[PDB]
Amino acid sequence: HMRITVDRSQFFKSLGRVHRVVPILSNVLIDAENGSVQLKATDLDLEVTESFTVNIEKAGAITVPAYLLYDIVRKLPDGSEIVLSVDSAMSIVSGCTHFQLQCLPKIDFPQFGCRFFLSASKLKHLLDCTQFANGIYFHIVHDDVLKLRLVATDGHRLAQVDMEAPSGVDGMPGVIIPRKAVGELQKLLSEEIDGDVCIELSETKIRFSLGSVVFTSKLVDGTFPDYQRVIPLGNDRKLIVNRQDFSSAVDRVSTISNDRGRAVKLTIEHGQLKLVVNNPDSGSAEDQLAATYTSEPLEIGFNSRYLLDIAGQLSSDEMVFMLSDAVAPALIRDNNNAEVLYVLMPVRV
Amino acid sequence: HMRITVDRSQFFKSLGRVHRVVERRNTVPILSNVLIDAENGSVQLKATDLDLEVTESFTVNIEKAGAITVPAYLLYDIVRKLPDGSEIVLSVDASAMSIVSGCTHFQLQCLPKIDFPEQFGCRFFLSASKLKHLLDCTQFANGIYFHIVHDDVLKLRLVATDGHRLAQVDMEAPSGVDGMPGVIIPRKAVGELQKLLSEEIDGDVCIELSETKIRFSLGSVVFTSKLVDGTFPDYQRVIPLGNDRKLIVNRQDFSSAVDRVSTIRAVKLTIEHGQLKLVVNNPDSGSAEDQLAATYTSEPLEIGFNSRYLLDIAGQLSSDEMVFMLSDAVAPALIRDNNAEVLYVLMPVRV
Question: In terms of domain of life, where is this protein from (chain A) (predicted)?
């Protein structure tokens, strides 16, 4: 048998962590042993586990559907006490509400060279800097000062972010993290308070331990083509604008093409910036802001949403552009931090 | 040719009221636009899907009077993103409109007003709260029948039914109703109307009904709708007459208990003397069980209903107690409050 008694709210919280991530694959395992209960589920490519300490009346395990169970505890009265028992039929009891679910036994349920730690907030920032740009490149750069670097690119468009690497990294290889795994991790980092994250990397998998939670993912098969090939080296013209004034301005003019005319034209003059979106079926838009520009006037266009993601992820009051012509990729960075760097393909305007 | 300066937020609010009616999927280009008529110190927005029309007016200091028709979703999405509390300047020089907010400048493709489409025997008034109350009781149950019953005391009554499943709500009739007939209001108009009353303060609503149309003026807003062609059946045939067994339960304990067991759509109610067990079954998922306190002294009954229809009825009933008028497991149930102004009829299901 198996029998445990849990606080409803503490159990509902513990359950939303595994909520997001084949009859056995829609279920979730509950293992009760040694004064702590561990919830666990997997999609073969990922695995999330959350454990909370509770007094356990009898030890055992069962595999039960996941979304249904989340929905039951959602409706169970707050702060109530739930009793979970077996006698492939699991019983739930909260007051006179007595459920009985169809289950599956645990038996049907499925070396780390590197190990170091990083704050959860610092971790999520690096992913948010790259998530909006296959996978993200996880490697170290040997620059006298080790820099842990993430790189995401799409042919020529690219996003790269660097940070001072912590102890235990030396010797870590270069691995590719699935985009599926990144999203589930930033969801996991959004739903917890800041803390320490233990990153352990094996031959095939990488694991993130955040206290109660442990997330695990397979890795991508392949090699990354030295992304430095797509980054421009000598972009002569330098342009500076207020980041918040710029985001808002880009936000306004792109409304006259909610559709495929997401392109916006940047007319660049000395210390001035005119923005131009046109739509033959909708009309024209215009805005102007003050810029720090002393190069040859340029007219170049970009995608509206790809800008607001980059600007959404930059942090200084000022935005920096390293440009060439209307056809060459731009280089976008902050004015105070060379931690992150972006490369954006121009579009025809 | 026209020039006005409006507060953005007050204009965004004024714009969300008529926002919904515009048919985004419409093919004719003027039907996706919205008319703005500027005259006599107030700005009136108006739009239609041929079947409905909303107009809303707000007072503005007006530099120049004139009119133009501008696409709606484009403009709604634009004004949403403009900084709050700002002032917007809207200009013509037809089918060419200029917008100015700071250094932002738009120029939209429009159509002149002349291209926009254009007697009420009955007229009476109703409190805004009481009106929305009558529809929320009915919305979840084509159209709904609008009529009065002459019961020595006139009773303004709303009826919506699905064969035997039915919803009826009565109210003391106001001045000016005598002579108003019975009309059917499209379900399209009801939903759009319940939204308009959620976004306005309580007040008095002027209902004007003609031979073919009915109009609702709620202060700033003016809503008008076509009526349905057809016949409504004589719903008194549908309401059960002699349901012997009567059962009373706590409304919120009942909703919550039904909500909890319905997580696993029919639920079986085993009714005994002073006892009520709730049971949902699922061969592919399993079973649920609950028990609640009931006021039952009739012959024990086992009868089932749809889970979602209960939570709407209990969601719309208002006393602590819910009442059921039953016969056997196959005869329709009658649910009432204890203020019996409204009543529901639900077909049972096999459980």
Answer: Bacteria
CB contact under 8 A, B264 and A89: no
Cα A76–Cα A82–Cα A88 angle in degrees, nearest 5: 105
Question: DSSP secondary-structure letter at B349?
Answer: B
Q: Are strands A237-242 and A263-269 parallel, antiparallel or unpaired?
A: unpaired
Helices (H) and strands (E) counted in chain A, each on its own, are 6, 26
- How many other C-beta atoms lie within 10 A of the C-beta of residue B137? 23
A252 Cβ under 8 Å from any chain B Cβ: yes
**A252 contacts on B by Cβ (under 8 Å):** 78, 81-82, 104
Tell me the nearest-neighbour CA distance from A279 into chain B, angstroms.
9
Q: What is the resolution of this structure in A?
A: 2.5
Helix axes A243-253, B72-81, angle to 10 degrees: 170
| CATH classification of the domain holding B104 | 3.10.150.10
Minimum-distance CB partner of B263 among A71, A98, A283: A71
Give CA–CA dist A49/A29, Å, rounded.
9
Interface contact B286-A258, CB threshold 8 A = no
Question: How far apart, in Å, do the first and last CA atoms of chain B sit?
Answer: 69
Method of determination used here: X-ray
Q: Which residues contact B23 (CB under 8 A, 6 or more apart)?
A: B31, B32, B49
- Cα distances (angstroms) measured from residue B224 to each of A259, B50, B190, B205, B280: 33, 10, 11, 13, 44
Q: What is the dihedral of CA A127, A132, A136, A139, to 10 degrees?
A: -50
Which among B74, B105, B261 is the nearest to A286, CB-wise?
A: B105
Q: CA-to-CA distance for A150 and B67, rounded, in angstroms?
A: 55
Q: By residue range, what is the domain housing residue B13?
A: 2-115
- How many CA atoms, within 13 angstroms, populate the side-chain half-sphere of residue A9? 4
Cα A55-A59-A61 angle, rounded to 5 deg? 115
Say yes or no for a CB contact (<8 Å) between A287 and B105. yes
